[PDB]
Design a binder for this molecule. Sequence first.
Ligand SMILES: CC(=O)N[C@H]1[C@H]([C@H](O)[C@H](O)CO)O[C@@](O[C@H]2[C@@H](O)[C@@H](CO)O[C@@H](O[C@H]3[C@H](O)[C@@H](O)[C@H](O)O[C@@H]3CO)[C@@H]2O)(C(=O)O)C[C@@H]1O
Ligand SMILES: [Ca+2]
Ligand SMILES: [Ca+2]
Ligand SMILES: [Ca+2]
Ligand SMILES: [Ca+2]
Ligand SMILES: [Ca+2]
Ligand SMILES: [Ca+2]
Lengths: 194, 201
Amino acid sequence: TDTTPPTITVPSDIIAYRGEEFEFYFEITDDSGQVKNIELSTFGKPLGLNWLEYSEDNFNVPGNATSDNPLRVRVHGTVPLNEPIPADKNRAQFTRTIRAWDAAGNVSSNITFVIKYRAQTDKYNPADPTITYVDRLSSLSPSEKNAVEAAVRAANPQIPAAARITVSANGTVTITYPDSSTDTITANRVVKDL
Amino acid sequence: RRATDTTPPTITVPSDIIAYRGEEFEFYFEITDDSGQVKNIELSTFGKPLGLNWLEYSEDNFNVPGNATSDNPLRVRVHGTVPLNEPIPADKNRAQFTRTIRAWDAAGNVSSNITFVIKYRAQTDKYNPADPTITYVDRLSSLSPSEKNAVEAAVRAANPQIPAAARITVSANGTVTITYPDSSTDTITANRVVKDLASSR
Ligand SMILES: CC(=O)N[C@H]1[C@H]([C@H](O)[C@H](O)CO)O[C@@](O[C@H]2[C@@H](O)[C@@H](CO)O[C@@H](O[C@H]3[C@H](O)[C@@H](O)[C@H](O)O[C@@H]3CO)[C@@H]2O)(C(=O)O)C[C@@H]1O
Ligand SMILES: [Ca+2]
Ligand SMILES: [Ca+2]
Ligand SMILES: [Ca+2]
Ligand SMILES: [Ca+2]
Ligand SMILES: [Ca+2]
Ligand SMILES: [Ca+2]
């Protein structure tokens, strides 16, 4: 008879960026070849992450969780755009647990997984724009600022369309991401004297 | 029939020359002579240097027989661009250059200088922005980056007549600034640009 609970592999680097959908997988195996169900919790208490969701496809089917072909549970969600980020980044995370059980009811211990979350600028790192030549490096014209923004945008299709690119009087570029975090492109990467 | 041409050419000048800074403009002088031939012209400041290096004209068809009759006058195309940052004083009407033109015929007769006036104005005198379609925002005092993008695109879409080189900026409360290439501006107040999304649903 089966007296051995399932075993769970969790991803080691779940990193989510505010306002951007993430996904990851748990992999569950049981010696019977069948996993019945799982539970996500805060060490047995309610999960408390209403923006997280996981698929229950293929739960409780014979052969759904063998060593060769484990049960792969897709988890996805979006950390809130305005989720506060602690000053200490080791605390900018949610530590949670998962347990699973087989058809005989053998339940695993609580296995820890950690969802780290970060500002969008930690994902983003703008690429170099083509240089814009300007008449005065300390006082860009409106047309030159338009050109600078266009060039930053053209070089960075991977940055959210919803990010706003602004240009200062000296050609310094600010990129403000939807979560209000920012990147800066120094003027020497952006403009040169005509 | 008189033995010689002693009559200088006759020049018609345009009456209302208006140029906007940074925008190419053009106007025409029309010149006739009793001989039918005009040799050349001079643009001056009452006989002094013109002192307007951005003013140009074509010498096409100059000094050609029949180039300047009453039926077919010599049409001289003058064109140029008033510099983007040409100073406009506190009195906008002082933003003008009074200059003079005369013309020679092929017999040595030169007309007496007559005046023409090039008025120049800021680009915002030419452009009147239409209000954008309203952008619906979550907080009227603190637009998001996507909402400012939307506002700018809405203003841009409602005003295709505005130059592409004009820069549209959007403040935290949705106040729009259109800064034309010559750095003159137009404003659209926030109440004509953004509305609260929740109250409008
Ligand atoms: C931007 C600006 O300040 N515009 C002025 C111009 C400029 O000062 C000048 O044209 C650029 O060189 O002067 C304006 O005044 C002139 C105007 O009153 C004309 C009238 O025909 O006369 C000029 O003085 C003449 C004078 O009439 C002649 O007798 C003399 O031989 O030459 C003088 C030199 O031009 C005035 O300067 C203008 O309209 O051009 C007024 C603008 O506000
Ligand atoms: Ca088992
Ligand atoms: Ca399977
Ligand atoms: Ca990074
Ligand atoms: Ca823009
Ligand atoms: Ca004559
Ligand atoms: Ca205007």
